[PDB]
Amino acid sequence: NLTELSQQLHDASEKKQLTAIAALAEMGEGGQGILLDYLAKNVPLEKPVLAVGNVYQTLRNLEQETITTQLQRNYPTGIFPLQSAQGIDYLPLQEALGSQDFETADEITRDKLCELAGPGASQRQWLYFTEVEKFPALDLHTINALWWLHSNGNFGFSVQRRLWLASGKEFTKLWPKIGWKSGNVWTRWPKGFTWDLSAPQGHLPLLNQLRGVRVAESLYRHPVWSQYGW
Ligand SMILES: C=CC1=C(C)/C(=C/c2[nH]c(/C=C3N=C(/C=C4\NC(=O)[C@H](C)\C4=C\C)C(C)=C\3CCC(=O)O)c(CCC(=O)O)c2C)NC1=O
Ligand SMILES: [Cl-]
């Protein structure tokens, strides 16, 4: 029933929205038209809204010519403002995430964090924890919003942070939870990682532990998360 499923999407229960979206996407032109109209009334986002990301990404994932064309024409930069306190271009990150190319998105995210830190980090291609502490909140918000909106809330530094808090801030308990260690075995980069949504919650983006936890801790303690309600 398209009428009842559209009503379910326009009601306020997020869990019932998500089931309606999945059902509508499998109902051809009528269901997909309801989803496209929903996007049109809710994009561009101001605050990240998981349902809106799920609608967009569900439609992208159909990989049908006309819907893909319509989405690219109407939302050429995606559904979320690509804002940067340093004028950085986040469209390549958005494009990788919209394609569900999470490995590429992980690589781009690492490159952008170095670019955000400055020439020293870009030259050495890794970060000092103090550079992380001084990141502008706006860029971290954009980066995280993209990861979260294009992963049904499963990926993002905000997701890792809340799992870390749930672990009593014990990093040795966090790694197994997000799939970065299995018992004694560190997950080998890149081939050991799971570059798709079957991965555990918080699996991406990656934070190499070769130089210790200081960068990750500085990132999870950064004021962006409380400031933007993550
Ligand atoms: C938490 C698990 C874990 C994560 C998240 C991980 C991610 C990760 N590891 C490497 C590289 C790497 N990782 C290692 C080794 C290791 N790195 C480690 O975190 C463990 C402690 C390890 C033990 C041998 C090495 C040697 C590289 C290559 C560094 C280089 O060649 O410059 C890279 C490429 C970026 C970079 O070089 O900094 C990523 C994204 N590897 C992991 O094992
Ligand atoms: Cl450091």
- 136 token code pair: 């502008």
With the most atoms of ligand 1 within 8 angstroms of its CB, the residue from 189, 194, 213 to mutate is 189
Hey, CA dihedral for 147, 150, 154, 158, is it positive or negative?
A: positive
* Residue with tokens 């109209």, as numbered in its chain: 37
Instruction: Supply the angle between the helices 137-149 and 102-117 in degrees, to the nearest 10.
Output: 180
Instruction: Supply the angle between the helices 50-61 and 14-25 in degrees, to the nearest 10.
Output: 10
CA dist 63 → 57, 71, 150, 206 (Å): 10, 11, 15, 27
The DSSP call for residue 209 is -
CA–CA gap between residue 204 and residue 196 (Å, rounded): 10
The alpha carbon of 214 and the centre of ligand 1 are apart by a number of angstroms equal to: 14
Spell out the residues 6+ positions from residue 161 whose beta carbon is closer than 8 angstroms to its own: 219, 220, 225, 230
Q: After which residues is the chain broken (C to N over 2.5 A)?
A: none
- 230 token code pair: 């993550």
Bridge partner list, 182:
185
Q: Which of 230, 24, 205, 5 is nearest to 114 (CA)?
A: 205
CA–CA gap between residue 44 and residue 177 (Å, rounded): 33
Q: Which of 61, 62, 92 is nearest to 78 (CA)?
A: 92
Q: How many CA atoms lie within 13 A of 124 on its CB side?
A: 8
Bridge partner list, 185:
182
CA–CA gap between residue 167 and residue 215 (Å, rounded): 18
CA–CA gap between residue 23 and residue 80 (Å, rounded): 24
The alpha carbon of 167 and the centre of ligand 1 are apart by a number of angstroms equal to: 22
3-state class of 137 per DSSP? helix
* Residue with tokens 């009528």, as numbered in its chain: 30
- 131 token code pair: 């550079």
**Burial class of residue 172, CB neighbours in 10 A (0-12, 13-18, 19+):** exposed
Method: X-ray
Contact yes or no for 28/57 (Cβ under 8 A): no
With the most atoms of ligand 1 within 8 angstroms of its CB, the residue from 131, 203, 210, 214 to mutate is 210
Indicate if ligand 1 lies below 6 Å from the C-beta of 121: no
| Resolution, expressed in angstroms to one decimal | 1.7
CA–CA gap between residue 148 and residue 154 (Å, rounded): 6
Q: Which of 204, 143, 132, 212 is nearest to 171 (CA)?
A: 212
CA–CA gap between residue 55 and residue 69 (Å, rounded): 16
Radius of gyration of the chain (CA): 18
Contact yes or no for 79/39 (Cβ under 8 A): yes
The DSSP call for residue 192 is T
CA–CA gap between residue 205 and residue 114 (Å, rounded): 14
Hey, CA dihedral for 44, 93, 52, 58, is it positive or negative?
A: positive
CA dist 225 → 75, 105, 217 (Å): 26, 21, 13
CA dist 10 → 51, 59, 103, 154 (Å): 11, 17, 34, 23
Indicate if ligand 1 lies below 6 Å from the C-beta of 208: yes
Contact yes or no for 43/75 (Cβ under 8 A): yes
CA–CA gap between residue 58 and residue 132 (Å, rounded): 33
With the most atoms of ligand 1 within 8 angstroms of its CB, the residue from 208, 213, 217 to mutate is 208
The DSSP call for residue 160 is H
Q: How many helices (H) and strands (E) does the chain have?
A: 14, 2
3-state class of 189 per DSSP? coil
